[PDB]
Short mmCIF file of C-alpha atoms and ligand atoms in Angstrom, two decimals:
data_model
loop_
_atom_site.label_atom_id
_atom_site.label_comp_id
_atom_site.label_asym_id
_atom_site.label_seq_id
_atom_site.Cartn_x
_atom_site.Cartn_y
_atom_site.Cartn_z
CA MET A 55 -13.45 -10.27 14.18
CA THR A 56 -13.46 -10.51 10.40
CA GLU A 57 -9.96 -10.06 8.97
CA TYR A 58 -10.11 -9.05 5.32
CA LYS A 59 -7.01 -9.73 3.23
CA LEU A 60 -6.75 -7.18 0.42
CA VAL A 61 -3.96 -6.02 -1.87
CA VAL A 62 -3.55 -2.93 -4.04
CA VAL A 63 -2.35 -3.12 -7.63
CA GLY A 64 -0.93 -0.36 -9.79
CA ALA A 65 2.32 1.27 -10.88
CA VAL A 66 4.78 4.03 -9.97
CA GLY A 67 3.11 7.42 -10.08
CA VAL A 68 -0.31 6.33 -8.88
CA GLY A 69 0.38 7.04 -5.22
CA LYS A 70 -1.34 4.06 -3.62
CA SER A 71 0.55 4.76 -0.40
CA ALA A 72 -0.91 8.26 -0.18
CA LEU A 73 -4.40 6.83 -0.60
CA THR A 74 -3.94 4.21 2.11
CA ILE A 75 -2.41 6.53 4.74
CA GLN A 76 -5.31 8.94 4.13
CA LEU A 77 -7.68 6.20 5.33
CA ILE A 78 -5.33 4.74 7.94
CA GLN A 79 -4.65 7.87 9.99
CA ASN A 80 -6.53 10.52 7.96
CA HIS A 81 -3.39 12.20 6.62
CA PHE A 82 -2.19 13.26 3.16
CA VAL A 83 1.49 12.82 2.37
CA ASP A 84 2.90 14.84 -0.54
CA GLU A 85 6.27 13.08 -0.68
CA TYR A 86 6.35 9.95 -2.83
CA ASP A 87 7.91 7.08 -0.90
CA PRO A 88 9.02 3.86 -2.64
CA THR A 89 6.88 1.27 -0.89
CA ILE A 90 8.14 -2.29 -1.15
CA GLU A 91 6.50 -4.02 1.79
CA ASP A 92 3.84 -2.25 3.86
CA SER A 93 0.84 -3.78 5.59
CA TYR A 94 -1.99 -1.72 7.05
CA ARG A 95 -4.26 -3.30 9.65
CA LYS A 96 -7.02 -0.84 10.51
CA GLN A 97 -10.35 -1.62 12.15
CA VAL A 98 -13.36 -0.35 10.21
CA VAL A 99 -17.03 -0.43 11.18
CA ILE A 100 -18.46 -1.50 7.83
CA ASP A 101 -22.25 -1.08 8.04
CA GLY A 102 -21.98 -1.57 11.79
CA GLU A 103 -19.66 -4.55 11.52
CA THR A 104 -16.38 -3.77 13.24
CA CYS A 105 -13.86 -5.75 11.21
CA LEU A 106 -10.14 -5.56 10.47
CA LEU A 107 -9.05 -4.38 7.05
CA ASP A 108 -5.57 -5.73 6.25
CA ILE A 109 -4.23 -3.92 3.21
CA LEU A 110 -0.83 -4.79 1.74
CA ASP A 111 0.75 -2.06 -0.38
CA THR A 112 2.69 -3.79 -3.13
CA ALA A 113 5.43 -2.24 -5.25
CA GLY A 114 4.40 -0.53 -8.47
CA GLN A 115 7.02 -2.44 -10.42
CA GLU A 116 7.53 -5.88 -11.94
CA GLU A 117 10.67 -6.73 -9.97
CA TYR A 118 9.00 -8.88 -7.32
CA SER A 119 6.65 -10.71 -9.68
CA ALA A 120 7.66 -14.07 -8.19
CA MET A 121 6.58 -12.80 -4.78
CA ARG A 122 3.39 -11.35 -6.22
CA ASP A 123 1.87 -14.80 -6.81
CA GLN A 124 2.20 -15.44 -3.06
CA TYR A 125 -0.30 -12.88 -1.77
CA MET A 126 -2.12 -12.86 -5.12
CA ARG A 127 -3.64 -16.20 -4.14
CA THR A 128 -4.19 -15.13 -0.52
CA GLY A 129 -5.81 -11.74 -1.13
CA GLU A 130 -9.51 -11.91 -1.93
CA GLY A 131 -10.04 -8.28 -2.84
CA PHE A 132 -7.93 -6.52 -5.44
CA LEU A 133 -7.84 -2.74 -5.26
CA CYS A 134 -7.25 -1.51 -8.81
CA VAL A 135 -6.38 2.18 -8.83
CA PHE A 136 -5.28 3.82 -12.07
CA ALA A 137 -4.14 7.41 -12.58
CA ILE A 138 -5.79 9.45 -15.34
CA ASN A 139 -2.48 11.30 -15.64
CA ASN A 140 -1.15 8.49 -17.82
CA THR A 141 -2.99 6.50 -20.48
CA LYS A 142 -0.61 3.57 -19.93
CA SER A 143 -2.20 2.90 -16.54
CA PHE A 144 -5.42 2.26 -18.46
CA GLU A 145 -3.66 -0.15 -20.80
CA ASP A 146 -1.84 -2.12 -18.08
CA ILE A 147 -5.26 -3.21 -16.85
CA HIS A 148 -5.13 -5.97 -19.46
CA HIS A 149 -1.86 -7.23 -17.95
CA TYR A 150 -3.26 -7.52 -14.44
CA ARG A 151 -6.54 -8.86 -15.84
CA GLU A 152 -5.01 -11.99 -17.36
CA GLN A 153 -2.54 -12.17 -14.46
CA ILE A 154 -5.21 -12.23 -11.74
CA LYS A 155 -7.50 -14.44 -13.85
CA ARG A 156 -4.78 -17.10 -13.93
CA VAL A 157 -3.68 -16.97 -10.27
CA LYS A 158 -7.30 -16.76 -9.08
CA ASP A 159 -8.22 -19.85 -11.12
CA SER A 160 -11.51 -18.12 -11.92
CA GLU A 161 -12.90 -15.63 -14.43
CA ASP A 162 -14.70 -13.79 -11.62
CA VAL A 163 -13.32 -12.28 -8.41
CA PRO A 164 -14.28 -9.29 -6.16
CA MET A 165 -12.28 -6.49 -7.77
CA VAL A 166 -12.89 -2.77 -8.02
CA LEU A 167 -11.62 -0.42 -10.70
CA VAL A 168 -11.27 3.16 -9.49
CA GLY A 169 -9.60 6.24 -10.91
CA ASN A 170 -7.22 8.43 -8.92
CA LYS A 171 -5.95 12.00 -9.35
CA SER A 172 -9.08 13.04 -11.25
CA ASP A 173 -8.63 16.50 -9.75
CA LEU A 174 -5.54 16.96 -11.93
CA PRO A 175 -5.85 19.22 -15.01
CA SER A 176 -4.17 16.49 -17.06
CA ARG A 177 -7.26 14.43 -17.82
CA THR A 178 -5.56 12.11 -20.30
CA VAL A 179 -8.03 9.36 -19.47
CA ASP A 180 -11.64 10.41 -20.00
CA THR A 181 -14.44 9.03 -17.83
CA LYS A 182 -16.31 7.57 -20.84
CA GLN A 183 -13.44 5.19 -21.57
CA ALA A 184 -13.34 4.13 -17.92
CA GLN A 185 -17.10 3.69 -17.62
CA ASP A 186 -17.41 1.78 -20.91
CA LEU A 187 -14.52 -0.53 -20.02
CA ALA A 188 -15.89 -1.04 -16.52
CA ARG A 189 -19.27 -1.86 -18.05
CA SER A 190 -17.61 -4.56 -20.18
CA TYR A 191 -16.83 -6.67 -17.10
CA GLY A 192 -19.70 -5.20 -15.13
CA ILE A 193 -17.62 -3.65 -12.37
CA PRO A 194 -18.39 -0.41 -10.47
CA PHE A 195 -16.08 2.47 -11.34
CA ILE A 196 -15.51 4.95 -8.52
CA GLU A 197 -13.86 8.32 -9.09
CA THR A 198 -11.48 8.96 -6.19
CA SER A 199 -8.73 11.30 -5.06
CA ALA A 200 -6.96 11.70 -1.74
CA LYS A 201 -6.03 15.24 -2.74
CA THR A 202 -9.64 16.41 -2.83
CA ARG A 203 -10.82 13.55 -0.57
CA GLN A 204 -14.27 12.96 -2.06
CA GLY A 205 -16.11 9.65 -1.92
CA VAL A 206 -12.98 7.86 -0.75
CA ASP A 207 -14.68 6.33 2.27
CA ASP A 208 -17.64 5.29 0.12
CA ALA A 209 -15.37 3.22 -2.13
CA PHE A 210 -13.95 1.33 0.85
CA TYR A 211 -17.32 0.74 2.52
CA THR A 212 -18.95 -0.57 -0.65
CA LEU A 213 -15.86 -2.65 -1.49
CA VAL A 214 -16.32 -4.80 1.61
CA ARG A 215 -19.96 -5.33 0.65
CA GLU A 216 -18.85 -6.92 -2.63
CA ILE A 217 -16.64 -9.29 -0.67
CA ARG A 218 -19.62 -10.21 1.52
CA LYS A 219 -21.78 -10.77 -1.56
CA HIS A 220 -19.10 -13.05 -3.03
CA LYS A 221 -19.47 -15.23 0.06
CA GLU A 222 -23.08 -14.94 1.15
O1 Z5I B 67 3.09 -12.53 4.58
C1 Z5I B 67 3.07 -11.51 5.32
O2 Z5I B 67 3.92 -11.28 6.21
C2 Z5I B 67 2.04 -10.60 5.14
C3 Z5I B 67 1.07 -10.82 4.18
C4 Z5I B 67 0.03 -9.90 4.00
C5 Z5I B 67 -0.13 -8.79 4.71
N1 Z5I B 67 -1.23 -8.17 4.27
C6 Z5I B 67 -1.78 -8.89 3.28
C7 Z5I B 67 -2.91 -8.69 2.50
C8 Z5I B 67 -3.24 -9.62 1.52
C9 Z5I B 67 -2.45 -10.74 1.32
C10 Z5I B 67 -1.32 -10.94 2.10
C11 Z5I B 67 -0.99 -10.01 3.08
#
């Protein structure tokens, strides 16, 4: 059984825990819980391949940065989810960019940049900015939301494919 080691990156307000639980047990939690250390091991039949998807929900802060480097070198796939509710989440991408680039010891690595909470009326971050930026690195941008739950599964299924392509 293929055991994929992935980690999610973001900040407080994104709601990465609400996105994970929605795909772990198909449930949407409204309450925001401060996640510090949570690992999700769920079996997914990706294109017919029943594999295990281990997802570690990291804190949306910079308090455990010394511990970040630990799984940052172990995780192959980086789930980058930014909220269009804040333009800062679109700026912090540069921080993680140079951060991952260093710890990964490579300029390339299977990463996906997706937007969350697009169903919110506060569209501070427009799709053109996201698409153009995504096109700079050549990464697929997927509009997602656990509130409306549209194309969420697609993002996960195609994500694994990128990991496969980075190997074979
Ligand atoms: O060290 C532990 O006890 C757990 C580590 C991890 C659990 N899920 C992960 C996903 C990517 C990288 C590391 C992990």
